[PDB]
Amino acid sequence: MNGTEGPNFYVPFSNKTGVVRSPFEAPQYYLAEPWQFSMLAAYMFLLIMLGFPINFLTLYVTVQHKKLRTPLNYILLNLAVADLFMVFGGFTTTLYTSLHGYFVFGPTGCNLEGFFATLGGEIALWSLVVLAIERYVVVCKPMSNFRFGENHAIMGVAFTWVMALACAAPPLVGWSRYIPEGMQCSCGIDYYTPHEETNNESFVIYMFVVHFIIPLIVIFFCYGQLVFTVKEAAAQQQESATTQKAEKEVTRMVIIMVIAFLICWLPYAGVAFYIFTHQGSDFGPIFMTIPAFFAKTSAVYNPVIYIMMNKQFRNCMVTTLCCGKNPLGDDEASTTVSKTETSQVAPA
Numbered sequence: 001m002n003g004t005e006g007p008n009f010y011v012p013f014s015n016k017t018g019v020v021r022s023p024f025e026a027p028q029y030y031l032a033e034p035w036q037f038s039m040l041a042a043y044m045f046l047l048i049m050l051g052f053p054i055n056f057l058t059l060y061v062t063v064q065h066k067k068l069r070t071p072l073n074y075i076l077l078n079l080a081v082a083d084l085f086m087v088f089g090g091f092t093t094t095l096y097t098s099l100h101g102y103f104v105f106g107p108t109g110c111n112l113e114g115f116f117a118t119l120g121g122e123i124a125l126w127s128l129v130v131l132a133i134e135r136y137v138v139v140c141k142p143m144s145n146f147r148f149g150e151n152h153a154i155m156g157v158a159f160t161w162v163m164a165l166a167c168a169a170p171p172l173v174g175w176s177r178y179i180p181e182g183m184q185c186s187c188g189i190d191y192y193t194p195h196e197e198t199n200n201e202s203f204v205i206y207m208f209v210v211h212f213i214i215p216l217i218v219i220f221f222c223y224g225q226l227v228f229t230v231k232e233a234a235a236q237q238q239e240s241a242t243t244q245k246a247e248k249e250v251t252r253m254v255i256i257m258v259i260a261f262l263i264c265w266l267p268y269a270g271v272a273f274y275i276f277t278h279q280g281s282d283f284g285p286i287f288m289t290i291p292a293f294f295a296k297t298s299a300v301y302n303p304v305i306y307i308m309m310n311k312q313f314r315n316c317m318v319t320t321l322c323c324g325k326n327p328l329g330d331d332e333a334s335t336t337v338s339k340t341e342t343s344q345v346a347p348a
Helices: 037-064 069-101 107-140 149-169 203-225 243-261 268-276 284-296 298-308 309-321
Strands: 178-183 188-190
Touching: 037 069, 037 284, 037 298, 069 107, 069 149, 069 298, 107 149, 107 178, 107 188, 107 203, 107 298, 149 188, 149 203, 149 298, 178 284, 188 203, 188 284, 188 298, 203 243, 243 268, 243 309, 268 284, 298 309
Parallel strands: none
Antiparallel strands: 178 188
């Protein structure tokens, strides 16, 4: 093979020189400099330092605050949870793996990186499939009476977790295993070899069709059906008594989360596919590695988006720090939500 294969792994590098050992048992410092793996070791550490306290902050604020109860805040809390799963779970393995330069926990450590990432990566995706259908019913209106209430929020969150576990789990009972990637610090599904002992040429097609390409058509469909109804446009301080202005401000954030998804995943999906088509071709370590760790900023953007645009949530998380007794003058145009302050608006 152009790229070396293993019984339970695959190192993308030539072995005519005769240096390649198992990423589980041995290091991989022939793929790069002695301080090149320190990048990843410092990258994961400085990412987990900003991943945990933002996801835990989002978790602390959303549940403690009242007005934040629509499917908007349920699903984006589900993401904050799904993202915190990664920072504490899958990211800590690859931090400790990148600290040594190889999976010190064995082939089990490959799963910790490959399980939490594939799990959290799909909850990031299928959340947008729930949020895509939310725009479809309330805005485009096939059924004008129907609207996503609190019931469909939890069924949406429950729906996201079922799809993620139907992708991440199956690899662990004789199906396509997780194999180290590039510098062998990130660990993803074996699309590197036609390992027909465990259906590595077959099972890879399952995830790229069911757990990927269908969702993006669903999101481009709802974004596409909004060719007439709600195109990219703006409005003043309030509309429909501070309803449609705040509602359309969420519509931005719903179909902005798909924009950020496409930026922080296509790069991995393009390279991961490039290796399936070319099964064991002549490609280097850096070519594949960057994609993976680049893509491992999905445990931070969903919180950032949930904060940055939505002014309904901006004023909420600030109040938890000090705990005051009344709202600011600029406000949100629909009363700001706080722990012991004005989380209230009389409906009209």
